[PDB]
Amino acid sequence: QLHEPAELLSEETKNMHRALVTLIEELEAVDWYQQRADACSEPGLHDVLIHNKNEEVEHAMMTLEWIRRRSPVFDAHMRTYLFTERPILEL
Amino acid sequence: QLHEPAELLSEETKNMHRALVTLIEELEAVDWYQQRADACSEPGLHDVLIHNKNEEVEHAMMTLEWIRRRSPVFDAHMRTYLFTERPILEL
Amino acid sequence: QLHEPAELLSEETKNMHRALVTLIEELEAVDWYQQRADACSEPGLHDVLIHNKNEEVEHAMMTLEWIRRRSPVFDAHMRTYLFTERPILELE
Amino acid sequence: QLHEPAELLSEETKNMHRALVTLIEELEAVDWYQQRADACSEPGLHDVLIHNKNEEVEHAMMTLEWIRRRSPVFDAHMRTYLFTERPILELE
Amino acid sequence: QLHEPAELLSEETKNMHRALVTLIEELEAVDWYQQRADACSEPGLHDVLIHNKNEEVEHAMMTLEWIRRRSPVFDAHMRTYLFTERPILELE
Amino acid sequence: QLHEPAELLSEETKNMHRALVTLIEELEAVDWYQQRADACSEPGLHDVLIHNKNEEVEHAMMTLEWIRRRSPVFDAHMRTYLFTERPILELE
Amino acid sequence: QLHEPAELLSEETKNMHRALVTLIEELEAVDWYQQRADACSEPGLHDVLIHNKNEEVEHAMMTLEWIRRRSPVFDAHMRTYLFTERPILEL
Amino acid sequence: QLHEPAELLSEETKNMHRALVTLIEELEAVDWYQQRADACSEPGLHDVLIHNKNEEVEHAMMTLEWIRRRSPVFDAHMRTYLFTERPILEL
Amino acid sequence: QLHEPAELLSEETKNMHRALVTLIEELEAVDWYQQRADACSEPGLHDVLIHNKNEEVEHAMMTLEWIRRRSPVFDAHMRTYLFTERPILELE
Amino acid sequence: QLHEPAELLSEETKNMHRALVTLIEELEAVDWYQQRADACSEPGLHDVLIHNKNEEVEHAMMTLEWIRRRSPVFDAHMRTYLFTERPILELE
Ligand code: NA
C-alpha cells in the first residue's frame, strides 16, 4: 500500500507506515461503530458495538503512544495540545 | 461519507465523525509525505515535505485534543497510555 | 454501503447488514494485523499488533454469536460444522 | 490483496489470508443476497436469492471451521461466546 | 449500484439489474475461488474452495435460466451458441 | 485484477479468468444499457442503446460457450438448468 | 454517476451525460479486450476477443456520431482534425 | 492501470492504451465541466468551465485522429458513421 | 462528491468545491500526460500529449486565478510564496 | 501510483509527480475542511477546521512555487493569469 517502492524507503519510514495505517484503521472503526450503534435498535447488538468501539479507542491510543516514543515531532506537538484547557488555537 | 441516515445519528456523533475523518486525513498526510520525502531525489522538495509533514502532525494533535475534551472514552485511554515508559502492553 | 434503498429493506436486513459488515471489518483487521506483524522490524510494534489482533478475533466471535441468536440459517450451519473433527466436506 | 511483500510473510499467514478473505466474501454475499431478496418482488427470483443466501452461510461456516482448527486464538474465543444464552458482554 | 434514478426505470429493468449483478457476483466467485485454490498449499482448504466454486457455478446457471425465461433476446442467442461444436464465430 | 501472484496460478486458471471477466463486463453492459435506454428521453439514443444492448448479450453467450467447452462443471450444470420449465429450485 | 443534483442540470446535459458515459465504457472495452487478446494463450479465445473488440469500436463511433449531431463544438473540432494527413498539431 | 502484466502486451497495445485512456479522461472532462457549469451559481466561473470544456473536446478529437491513423478498425467504423445524416442504425 | 449534504453548505463553499475539483482534475491530467509522453515511443502521440498537457496547465492556472479572486487566504499565501527566489522555507 | 514504469520516466517527471500529488492532496484538504466547517455545529471545531484549512492553502502554494521554479510551462501560464484584474478569458 506504499505510495513509493519499498527499495526507496528506509526501515523507519516503513515501520511508521505500519503503525500509522493501524492507527487509521482503528480510528475508522471508532467512527463506524458509533454510527451503527446510534442507528441500531436491537439492544444486544448495541451493547456489543459500543463495547468494541471503546476497545478500538484503546488500541488507537496504544498505537499512538508507540509512535510518540519514536517520533520527536509527535512528542513535541502532543505536549503542546493534549490535556489542556485554553482554547485550542491559543496554545 | 456517513454510513447511516443523519436523522438517526446524534449531533455529537456527527460532529465526532467530522473530527475523526479530519484526524484520519491528517495522519494519512504524515505517512505519505514521509514516503515521498524518502524517495525524493531533490533536496529542495525534501525540506518542504518534511516541514509540512510536521505541521500535519500538529494539526492531528489539535484535532485529537478536541476529541478528548468531548469523549470520556478517549480521555480515559489517553490518560492510561500517553507519555508513559513501561512496555505498552503492561499498561 | 447498502446496495438497495433503505425504504425497501426490513430492519432485520439493516440490522444484519450492520452486524455483518462489523464482523467483516474485524476479520479484515485479523488478516492485516498478522501481515504487518510478520513484516514488522521493531519487536515492540510486533507485540502490540499480535495482542490487538487477538482482541479483534474476540470482537469477531462476539459479533458472530449475536448473528447466530438472530439468524436461524446461521444457527443451523454453525451446528453442522463448528467444533468438529473429520474432513469438512464429509460433514455436508 | 496482500499488504506486505510475499517474501516477508510465513506460509501460515498467507494461507490464513486466503481463508479469511474467502470468509469475508462469503459473508458479503449473505448481506447482498438478503438485500436483493427484500427489494425483489418476483417470488421466483426472491426464492433463488434466499436459497443461495443460505448456501453462502454454509460456505462461510465451513471456512470458519477450517480457521478454528489451525488457530488457537479463534478456538479459545469461539469456545467462550458461540452457543451461549447470557448477555454477550457477560461471557468475557 | 444503479446508474439511473429509480423513478425512471421500469420494474422489469430493476429486477433484471438484480438478476444480472447476482450472476456477475457468482461468476466473480468462480474466478476467485479457483485462483486461491491454485495458490493455497493446504489440501483441506483446497478441497473446500473447489467445492464452493462448483456450487457458485450452479447458482450462476440458476440465475441465467431465470433471465432466459424472462428475456427473448437471451433465449435466441443462447439457442444459437450454447451446446454446439463449430468454431464460435462461425455460428453467426 | 488478479487475486494471486501470476507464478502461482496455472495457465488454465489465468485464461479462465480472462474469459470470466469478459463475460462479466458484457453482462454489466447489458444492465447499464437497459437502464440508460429506460431513462433516455431521445428516440435515436434510445434506439442505439437497445441495439447495442442486444449485441452485448450475443458477446456474452459467445464467451459462455467457450467456457462451457473447457469446464465440465459449467457443462454439467448448464444441462441441468438451462432450457427447462419446472420451478428452478425443483431442478437438481 | 452525476456529480450534481439532477434538478440543477438541463435535460440536454443529462442526455449528453448518458451518451458520453456510454462512449467511455465502449472505449474502455476496446482497450481491455485488446489487452486480453495479447496476453491470451488459447487461439479460440483470442479471436472471440478481437471480434468483439471490433464491434465495440463500432458501437463507440455510433455513439460519437449521435453526439456530433447535437453538439456544434464536437462538430467543429471533428471537422478540423478527423480524416486528415498533416501533423496533428499543424491543424 | 493496465489489466495484464506489461510483459505480455505488445508496445502497440500499450500505445493504444495510452491514447484511449487520454481520450476517456478528456471525454470525462467534457461531461463533468458541463455539469458544474449548469449547476454553477457564478457566471464568471461558468464561462471558464464552458470555454475549457470546448478545448477538452478539441483535445479529444486530436487524440481520436491519432487513433484513427493507427487503427484500421477505427478508420473503417469512423468512415461508416461519422458526418452522416440518416438514422444511425440504417448505416 | 460533496462530503456533506448540500443543504448544510453555503453557496460560496459549493462553488469553491466546483472550482477546486476542476483544478484538481487538471493537475491530475498534467501529471498523467507527462508520464505517458515519457513512456510513449510514437512521435505523433508524444507531441499531442505534451501540447495538451500544457493547455491543462493553462486551464489550471485560470481556475486558480478565479479562486484567488474569491479567497483572501489564497491571495495572502500566494503573495508570500509565488514568484520568489529565497529558499521556500525562508519565506515564512 | 505511477501509471508507467519508473525506468522509462525521467527523474524530473517522477519528482514532479510527487509534487503534483502533494499539491492535489493539499487542495483536497482545502475543499473538505470548508465543507466540514460549514456543516459543523460546534464553534470550537469550526475554528480549528478553518485555521488548519488555511495552513493547507499555505502548503499548496509552497508546493506550487517549487513546481513553478522547475516547470517552464507552469511559470509561463502563471505569469499570464495570476494577480490579474480583467476577465480571465480575455488574458488568453
Ligand atoms: Na446439521
PDB file of C-alpha atoms in Angstrom, chain A:
ATOM      1  CA  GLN A   1       0.000   0.000   0.000  1.00  0.00           C
ATOM      2  CA  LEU A   2       3.093   2.203  -0.118  1.00  0.00           C
ATOM      3  CA  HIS A   3       2.895   5.218  -2.413  1.00  0.00           C
ATOM      4  CA  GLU A   4       6.574   4.576  -3.231  1.00  0.00           C
ATOM      5  CA  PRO A   5       8.548   1.395  -3.947  1.00  0.00           C
ATOM      6  CA  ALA A   6       9.948  -0.289  -0.856  1.00  0.00           C
ATOM      7  CA  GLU A   7      13.575  -0.083  -2.032  1.00  0.00           C
ATOM      8  CA  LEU A   8      13.473   3.737  -1.791  1.00  0.00           C
ATOM      9  CA  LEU A   9      12.103   3.737   1.783  1.00  0.00           C
ATOM     10  CA  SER A  10      14.113   3.330   4.967  1.00  0.00           C
ATOM     11  CA  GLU A  11      13.022   0.775   7.554  1.00  0.00           C
ATOM     12  CA  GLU A  12      11.982   3.557   9.942  1.00  0.00           C
ATOM     13  CA  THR A  13       9.556   5.007   7.397  1.00  0.00           C
ATOM     14  CA  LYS A  14       8.140   1.569   6.587  1.00  0.00           C
ATOM     15  CA  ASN A  15       7.555   0.765  10.272  1.00  0.00           C
ATOM     16  CA  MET A  16       6.000   4.190  10.855  1.00  0.00           C
ATOM     17  CA  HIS A  17       3.751   3.452   7.874  1.00  0.00           C
ATOM     18  CA  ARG A  18       2.631   0.203   9.515  1.00  0.00           C
ATOM     19  CA  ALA A  19       1.785   1.997  12.769  1.00  0.00           C
ATOM     20  CA  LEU A  20       0.033   4.889  11.026  1.00  0.00           C
ATOM     21  CA  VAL A  21      -2.282   2.716   8.914  1.00  0.00           C
ATOM     22  CA  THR A  22      -3.050   0.627  12.005  1.00  0.00           C
ATOM     23  CA  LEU A  23      -3.984   3.773  13.936  1.00  0.00           C
ATOM     24  CA  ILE A  24      -6.035   4.982  10.956  1.00  0.00           C
ATOM     25  CA  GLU A  25      -7.985   1.720  10.716  1.00  0.00           C
ATOM     26  CA  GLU A  26      -8.739   1.767  14.435  1.00  0.00           C
ATOM     27  CA  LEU A  27      -9.985   5.362  14.294  1.00  0.00           C
ATOM     28  CA  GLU A  28     -12.199   4.440  11.339  1.00  0.00           C
ATOM     29  CA  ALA A  29     -13.755   1.641  13.400  1.00  0.00           C
ATOM     30  CA  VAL A  30     -14.401   4.110  16.232  1.00  0.00           C
ATOM     31  CA  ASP A  31     -16.378   6.306  13.840  1.00  0.00           C
ATOM     32  CA  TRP A  32     -18.225   3.451  12.121  1.00  0.00           C
ATOM     33  CA  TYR A  33     -19.164   1.543  15.290  1.00  0.00           C
ATOM     34  CA  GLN A  34     -20.624   4.669  16.911  1.00  0.00           C
ATOM     35  CA  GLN A  35     -22.683   5.384  13.790  1.00  0.00           C
ATOM     36  CA  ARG A  36     -24.091   1.855  13.723  1.00  0.00           C
ATOM     37  CA  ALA A  37     -24.896   1.898  17.449  1.00  0.00           C
ATOM     38  CA  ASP A  38     -26.859   5.143  17.055  1.00  0.00           C
ATOM     39  CA  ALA A  39     -28.855   3.613  14.186  1.00  0.00           C
ATOM     40  CA  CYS A  40     -29.169   0.150  15.786  1.00  0.00           C
ATOM     41  CA  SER A  41     -32.443  -0.545  17.606  1.00  0.00           C
ATOM     42  CA  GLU A  42     -31.554  -4.045  18.878  1.00  0.00           C
ATOM     43  CA  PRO A  43     -30.292  -3.861  22.495  1.00  0.00           C
ATOM     44  CA  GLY A  44     -27.890  -6.807  22.263  1.00  0.00           C
ATOM     45  CA  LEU A  45     -26.180  -5.536  19.119  1.00  0.00           C
ATOM     46  CA  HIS A  46     -25.953  -2.011  20.548  1.00  0.00           C
ATOM     47  CA  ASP A  47     -24.057  -3.133  23.657  1.00  0.00           C
ATOM     48  CA  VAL A  48     -21.542  -5.085  21.564  1.00  0.00           C
ATOM     49  CA  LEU A  49     -20.922  -2.178  19.166  1.00  0.00           C
ATOM     50  CA  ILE A  50     -20.245   0.316  21.972  1.00  0.00           C
ATOM     51  CA  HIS A  51     -18.075  -2.082  23.973  1.00  0.00           C
ATOM     52  CA  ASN A  52     -15.889  -2.943  20.990  1.00  0.00           C
ATOM     53  CA  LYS A  53     -15.758   0.698  19.875  1.00  0.00           C
ATOM     54  CA  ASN A  54     -14.197   1.555  23.230  1.00  0.00           C
ATOM     55  CA  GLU A  55     -11.574  -1.166  22.833  1.00  0.00           C
ATOM     56  CA  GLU A  56     -10.773   0.317  19.415  1.00  0.00           C
ATOM     57  CA  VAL A  57     -10.121   3.642  21.144  1.00  0.00           C
ATOM     58  CA  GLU A  58      -7.735   1.787  23.454  1.00  0.00           C
ATOM     59  CA  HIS A  59      -5.941   0.117  20.542  1.00  0.00           C
ATOM     60  CA  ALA A  60      -5.667   3.502  18.821  1.00  0.00           C
ATOM     61  CA  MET A  61      -4.081   5.159  21.851  1.00  0.00           C
ATOM     62  CA  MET A  62      -1.761   2.174  22.310  1.00  0.00           C
ATOM     63  CA  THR A  63      -0.525   2.682  18.743  1.00  0.00           C
ATOM     64  CA  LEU A  64      -0.244   6.455  19.150  1.00  0.00           C
ATOM     65  CA  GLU A  65       1.991   6.070  22.209  1.00  0.00           C
ATOM     66  CA  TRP A  66       4.248   3.711  20.257  1.00  0.00           C
ATOM     67  CA  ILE A  67       4.543   6.427  17.595  1.00  0.00           C
ATOM     68  CA  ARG A  68       5.238   9.119  20.196  1.00  0.00           C
ATOM     69  CA  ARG A  69       8.152   7.082  21.581  1.00  0.00           C
ATOM     70  CA  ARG A  70       9.885   7.041  18.169  1.00  0.00           C
ATOM     71  CA  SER A  71       8.861  10.489  16.855  1.00  0.00           C
ATOM     72  CA  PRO A  72      10.237  13.667  18.464  1.00  0.00           C
ATOM     73  CA  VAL A  73       7.796  15.693  16.342  1.00  0.00           C
ATOM     74  CA  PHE A  74       4.745  13.828  17.643  1.00  0.00           C
ATOM     75  CA  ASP A  75       6.163  14.189  21.160  1.00  0.00           C
ATOM     76  CA  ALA A  76       6.666  17.943  20.745  1.00  0.00           C
ATOM     77  CA  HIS A  77       3.183  18.615  19.359  1.00  0.00           C
ATOM     78  CA  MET A  78       1.468  16.270  21.840  1.00  0.00           C
ATOM     79  CA  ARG A  79       2.979  18.147  24.794  1.00  0.00           C
ATOM     80  CA  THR A  80       1.612  21.426  23.397  1.00  0.00           C
ATOM     81  CA  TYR A  81      -2.019  20.445  22.830  1.00  0.00           C
ATOM     82  CA  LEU A  82      -3.031  17.318  24.763  1.00  0.00           C
ATOM     83  CA  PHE A  83      -4.597  17.697  28.224  1.00  0.00           C
ATOM     84  CA  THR A  84      -5.101  21.471  28.074  1.00  0.00           C
ATOM     85  CA  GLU A  85      -7.942  23.813  28.980  1.00  0.00           C
ATOM     86  CA  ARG A  86      -7.450  27.024  26.996  1.00  0.00           C
ATOM     87  CA  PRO A  87      -8.966  27.420  23.515  1.00  0.00           C
ATOM     88  CA  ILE A  88      -7.014  25.105  21.229  1.00  0.00           C
ATOM     89  CA  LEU A  89      -5.877  27.858  18.853  1.00  0.00           C
ATOM     90  CA  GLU A  90      -4.327  29.796  21.767  1.00  0.00           C
ATOM     91  CA  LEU A  91      -1.654  27.178  22.556  1.00  0.00           C
TER      92      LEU A  91
END
